[PDB]
Amino acid sequence: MFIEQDIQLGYVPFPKSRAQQYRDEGCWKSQTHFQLLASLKDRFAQRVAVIQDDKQLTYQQLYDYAIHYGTYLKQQGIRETDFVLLQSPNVIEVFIVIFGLYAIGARPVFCLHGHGSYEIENIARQSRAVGFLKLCGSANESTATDVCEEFSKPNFKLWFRESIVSRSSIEASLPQLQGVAPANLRAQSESEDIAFLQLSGGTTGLPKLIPRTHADYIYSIEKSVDVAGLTQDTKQLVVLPVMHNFCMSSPGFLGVFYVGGTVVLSQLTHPRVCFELIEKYQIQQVSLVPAIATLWLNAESLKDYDLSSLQVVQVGGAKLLPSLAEQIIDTLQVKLQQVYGMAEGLVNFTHLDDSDQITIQTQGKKLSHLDEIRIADDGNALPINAIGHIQTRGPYTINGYYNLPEINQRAFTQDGFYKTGDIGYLDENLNIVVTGREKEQINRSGEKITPSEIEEFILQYPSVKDVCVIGVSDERIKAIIIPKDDSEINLKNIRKFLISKNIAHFKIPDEIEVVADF
């Protein structure tokens, strides 16, 4: 079985007990991403799935192009369970390449547009990817081979390097299909096999690989569809990066596909462009982050377009100020829907029948009744209305990043809960309220220190069992160390140990404290 090899390659699977419950309860279903697409072509063949400028794909056309492009990848040497990096802006051909890979059982590795070669190089190595597919909005951008020529080290195993330039027609975007006869392409992947790798939030360093299976990702999409209220008449505007988990599935373009609705792709966030598309296509839903909502609400063009069709606006990132939330609701005359989610798994939505106050003040309810949210104090669970470290496990939450055993020992609890790094509380209605991050960045005399970084090194000290690197005002760096009982755990020795390891001088603790617990 593929899972046997995957485990040896760094995949941490769902424990057998928890996997059975998720089967028994009807969470995990038996469709891969491509079996889902086939059944969507069966139900919604002639419905428009995607629009981008003057290009458009019905569900039938999406499935046909995907078959064709999958046949081409197969002829080029891509094999089932191979990892392939996919970097792309918001162009319509990205849906052909995603499902083309799914059609032969290849495994996408989703990379944000705007990630540099520095990010691509480490992701390619860590995933052992054999391919890099890069889509370009124009003939000016860097091709897949241009990016690979920037690597510091050769990567011989990443031998497939293909670029697609998005042009005025789909047929002209995929000229390599011209000499390929479409194939009955048959992958043997099961729904519980790994479907793809996502990337974690890359604000503090190199992104981590996140393995999702078909069954658990499609389950999350099914649930998101219900809570966002999507139907086959839904028209959704896509302004966020297509490669990002939010835009993909919360409820994302996959949620719209799932119901036979229409996705409208814009390469741009510019207010006037988006307002025009909303008016033109009578868009009813859009997902935003606060920075885009601020841009829209302060545009003086707001009054020049008919935005009457807007019904719901998702806002994700868990960093939405109540004042802006209320401005969103009243200015756009929509139901606000806050989304607190993460590529690693758990997603929380406010509900469409929620009071406006709840949508203003909270990030709503977990997708699954089998989702488990622990607000941890020392590790112990806290009651309602107590602020603590948000931890989670459930039917679509990863049990480990891919091919990262040392990080995994730290990013998950002993009983297998994912540690989000966020703090917050569950209120009286069981709505999550995110109030901040567990360990923010320290401002030590100009330098910005990532606590997680200093913690990793200090954990390489033999007698150390736990450390928490915090900042004090003056800002100084303090390390709270829990010993395994060692007088050699002291400031001078820890500092010299870190210097010897060649960390940045400006990231060494200025103070130590050896306690028995936090």
Ligand X SMILES: O=C(O)c1cccc(O)c1O
Minimal distance, residue 457 CB to ligand X, in Å: 27
State which residue has the least CB distance to ligand X.
341
Minimal distance, residue 339 CB to ligand X, in Å: 4
* CB crowding 4-29: b at 16 or more within 10 Å, else e: eebeeebbbbbeeebbeebeeeebbe
Burial class from Cβ neighbours inside 10 Å (0-12, 13-18, 19+) for residue 220 reads buried
Residue whose CB is less far from ligand X, 163 or 249: 249
Minimal distance, residue 418 CB to ligand X, in Å: 13
Q: Give a three-class secondary structure readout of 373-424.
A: EEEECCCCECCCCCCEEEEEECCCCCCCCCCCHHHHHHHECCCCCEEEEEEE
Residue whose CB is less far from ligand X, 10 or 316: 316
Minimal distance, residue 48 CB to ligand X, in Å: 25
CA dihedral 287, 290, 296, 297 (to 10 degrees): 120
Residue whose CB is less far from ligand X, 367 or 470: 367
Residue whose CB is less far from ligand X, 210 or 468: 210
Rg of the chain, C-alpha, whole Å: 24
Tally the residues of the chain: 518
Minimal distance, residue 123 CB to ligand X, in Å: 17
Minimal distance, residue 246 CB to ligand X, in Å: 4
Burial class from Cβ neighbours inside 10 Å (0-12, 13-18, 19+) for residue 513 reads middle
* Residue 281, beta-bridge partner list: none
Minimal distance, residue 198 CB to ligand X, in Å: 8
The secondary element (H helix, E strand) that includes residue 7 is: helix 2-8
Residue whose CB is less far from ligand X, 166 or 200: 200
The secondary element (H helix, E strand) that includes residue 478 is: strand 476-483
Residue whose CB is less far from ligand X, 217 or 457: 217
Minimal distance, residue 464 CB to ligand X, in Å: 31
Question: Could you give the angle at the alpha carbon of 424 between the alpha carbons of 419 and 428, nearest 5°?
Answer: 125
Residue with tokens 């490669």: 243
User: In angstroms, how far is CA 238 from the centroid of its own chain?
Assistant: 15
The secondary element (H helix, E strand) that includes residue 212 is: strand 209-213
Minimal distance, residue 313 CB to ligand X, in Å: 13
By the 8 A CB rule, do 10 and 404 touch?
A: yes
Site residues, ligand X (CB under 6 A):
245-246, 249-250, 316-317, 339, 341-343, 347
Residue whose CB is less far from ligand X, 213 or 249: 249
Measured distance CA(460)–CA(453) in Å, rounded:
12
Measured distance CA(256)–CA(263) in Å, rounded:
7
Minimal distance, residue 331 CB to ligand X, in Å: 22
Q: Give Cβ neighbours of residue 492 (< 8 Å, ≥ 6 apart).
A: none
Residue whose CB is less far from ligand X, 96 or 342: 342
* Residue 480, beta-bridge partner list: 468, 513
How many Cβ atoms sit within 10 Å of the Cβ of residue 49? 25
Q: Which of 198, 20, 186, 201 is nearest to 123 (CA)?
A: 198
Residue whose CB is less far from ligand X, 126 or 348: 348
Minimal distance, residue 231 CB to ligand X, in Å: 21
- How is 299-320 classified by DSSP, letter by letter? -GGGGGS--TT--EEEEESS--
Measured distance CA(353)–CA(330) in Å, rounded:
17
Minimal distance, residue 193 CB to ligand X, in Å: 21
